[PDB]
Amino acid sequence: NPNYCFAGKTSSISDLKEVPRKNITLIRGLGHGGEVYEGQVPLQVAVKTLPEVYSEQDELDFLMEALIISKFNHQNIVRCIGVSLQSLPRFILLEFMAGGDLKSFLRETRPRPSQPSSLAMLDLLHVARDIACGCQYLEENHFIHRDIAARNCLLTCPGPGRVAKIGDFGMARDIYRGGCAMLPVKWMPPEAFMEGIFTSKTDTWSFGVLLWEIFSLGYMPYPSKSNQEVLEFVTSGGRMDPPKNCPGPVYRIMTQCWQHQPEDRPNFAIILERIEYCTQDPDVINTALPIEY
Ligand SMILES: C[C@@H](Oc1cc(-c2cnn(C3CCNCC3)c2)cnc1N)c1c(Cl)ccc(F)c1Cl
Numbered sequence: 105n106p107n108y109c110f111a112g113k114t115s116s117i118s119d120l121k122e123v124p125r126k127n128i129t130l131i132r133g134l135g136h137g138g139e140v141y142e143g144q145v146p147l148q149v150a151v152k153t154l155p156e157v158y159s160e161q162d163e164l165d166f167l168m169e170a171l172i173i174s175k176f177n178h179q180n181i182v183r184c185i186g187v188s189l190q191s192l193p194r195f196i197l198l199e200f201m202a203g204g205d206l207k208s209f210l211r212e213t214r215p216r217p218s219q220p221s222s223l224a225m226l227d228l229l230h231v232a233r234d235i236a237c238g239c240q241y242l243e244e245n246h247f248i249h250r251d252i253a254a255r256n257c258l259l260t261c262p263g264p265g266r267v268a269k270i271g272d273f274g275m276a277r278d279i280y281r282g283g284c285a286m287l288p289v290k291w292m293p294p295e296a297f298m299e300g301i302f303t304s305k306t307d308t309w310s311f312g313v314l315l316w317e318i319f320s321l322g323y324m325p326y327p328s329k330s331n332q333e334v335l336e337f338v339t340s341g342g343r344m345d346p347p348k349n350c351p352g353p354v355y356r357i358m359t360q361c362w363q364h365q366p367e368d369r370p371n372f373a374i375i376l377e378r379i380e381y382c383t384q385d386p387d388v389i390n391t392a393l394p395i396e397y
Pocket residue numbers: 134135140150152182198199200201202203204205255256257258270271272
């Protein structure tokens with residue numbers, strides 16, 4: 105079995121905490137991709153399954169992801185409860201995030217003529233703060249996520265106490281051990297998609313796009329552009345306009361995240377400071393979010 109190194113320590117799949125199959129119950133499907141369920145171990149879990157029809161490479165990839173997540177220790181990264189590997193299909197057990205993924209949440213929770221104050225600017229800033237905090241943790245432990253995006257973030261619950269966490273590490277796992285049309289190029293900086301260069305400044309760019317996802321309330325980035333057009337657009341200096349009703353201080357963070365040169369972009373410590381200043385500015389957090397009719 106493969107070895108993984110994070111922080112100063114080196115681990116092995118054998119080190120994954122095994123949960124006996126008999127203690128695990130599958131309650132319902134959670135919209136599968138492999139399949140994902142809500143489960144109980146009483147501990148409420150999310151269960152990620154490895155399809156049995158998959159081969160050998162996928163099997164190691166699958167466990168590698170549990171190993172990667174298991175070695176993190178931070179409040180804004182989803183916890184791995186353990187694995188169940190001594191029965192088919194293979195299970196990975198994760199902290200259950202009742203709020204679901206961030207993109208769906210945003211789309212489904214957009215203020216309406218009936219619920220105009222469902223979400224406010226401060227809620228968005230706190231989600232952005234949560235994830236920036238997870239990213240800072242990754243950056244200072246020299247881990248590059250490579251796929252920061254709303255679809256890969258989770259919320260603890262729907263309501264006001266919600267905490268956002270980074271949840272999917274499949275891209276990081278892949279590069280660790282494939283096609284053009286499966287690369288998240290709309291979240292990637294030029295040096296990333298042109299040269300395959302990835303640094304912590306790679307994630308800073310992606311976080312800027314996520315910001316935009318957050319303050320658009322779940323729109324797909326670069327609306328009405330294809331990947332190839334975005335690639336040519338961004339390479340040419342093109343950048344997205346502000347989401348609707350987006351305060352200038354928030355947009356300004358996005359545009360700094362999208363500086364063409366990696367060394368001109370902020371590290372996550374700087375992004376956090378700037379996000380916190382936004383939570384202090386009444387002209388930011390008193391701004392009304394748009395309503396779709
Ligand atoms: C692997 C899977 O794990 C979870 C899914 C979910 C989830 C998905 N959907 N829902 C809904 C359950 C019913 N109520 C609304 C949310 C919960 C919660 N916690 C998880 N750890 C997952 C998914 Cl499906 C999507 C994005 C992610 F970043 C992750 Cl990490």
